[PDB]
């Protein structure tokens, strides 16, 4: 199971509430020679921070193509990006989305 190289592409991010943001991505398994994917890592940080160590991480199963980030702060902008992974390692990051809770 070669480590993934190419990451997912986040198609959209949209607030669902004052504490939750939905993201949906596309990941084409052929992009990494159909290496098995254990899951995705979804990273989010308040947009007011430019410290790349300040991202929090959610772990999602490898079959999902969307996720709802929760426990966020109201009326707050987040930077959101993601990787895919397997036992070999992690991909490069996706595009970086900016999205505010309600």
């Amino acid at each position: 199971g070669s480590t993934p190289i190419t990451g997912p592409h986040i198609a959209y991010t949209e607030a669902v509430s004052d504490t939750q943001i939905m993201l949906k991505w596309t990941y084409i398994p052929s992009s990494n020679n159909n290496t098995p994917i254990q899951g995705f890592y979804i990273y989010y940080r308040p947009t007011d921070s430019d410290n790349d160590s300040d991202y929090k991480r959610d772990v999602v199963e490898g079959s999902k193509q969307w996720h709802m980030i929760g426990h966020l702060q109201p009326e707050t902008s987040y930077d959101i990006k993601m990787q895919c992974f397997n036992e070999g390692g992690e991909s490069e990051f996706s595009n970086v989305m900016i999205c505010e809770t309600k």
Binding site: I10, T13, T47, D50, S77, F93, N95, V96, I98, E100
Partner: protein, 151 residues
């Protein structure tokens, strides 16, 4: 003479893509496209670029945008000692902006002050109008959106 904009106000108070403001969308500029060459990176030390992308995309903009942004950098520093202009988005290839966003052709910036003081943003927006941006929009409590006409 400087009157802050209110939250959600835009100036001039007409649609962004009208003639009197920033004018029409001319098409997305992608990194590999022939049109990518008309963007150049702004490396002004007076400006902080968020660059959460870690690509330098935020620095890329048209000449008209760079000129207006550099003027605004000055007026921010003059207004508030020790505060600088910060750009969260310049040219964009991530794709989270409106359809046909001027960000996609390097004609728009989203900005804050360096101290992220939300109550500076109305005045920051007025400074951007005075700096000559063709449309300025207090779009979010979190940032101001400013754009320019095509070259």
């Amino acid at each position: 003479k400087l009157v802050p904009l209110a939250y959600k106000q835009f100036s001039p108070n007409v649609p962004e893509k009208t003639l009197g403001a920033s004018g029409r969308y001319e098409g997305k500029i992608a990194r590999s496209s022939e049109r990518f060459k008309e963007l150049t990176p702004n490396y002004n030390p007076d400006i902080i670029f968020k660059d959460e992308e870690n690509t330098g995309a935020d620095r890329l903009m048209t000449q008209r945008c760079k000129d207006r942004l550099n003027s605004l950098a000055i007026s921010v520093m003059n207004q508030w000692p020790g505060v600088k202009l910060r750009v969260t988005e310049g040219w964009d290839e991530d794709g989270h902006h409106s359809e046909e966003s001027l960000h996609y052709e390097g004609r728009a910036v989203d900005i804050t002050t360096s101290d992220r003081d939300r109550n500076k943003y109305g005045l920051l927006a007025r400074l951007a109008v005075e700096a000559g941006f063709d449309w300025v929009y207090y779009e979010s409590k979190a940032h101001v959106h400013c754009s320019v006409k095509s070259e």
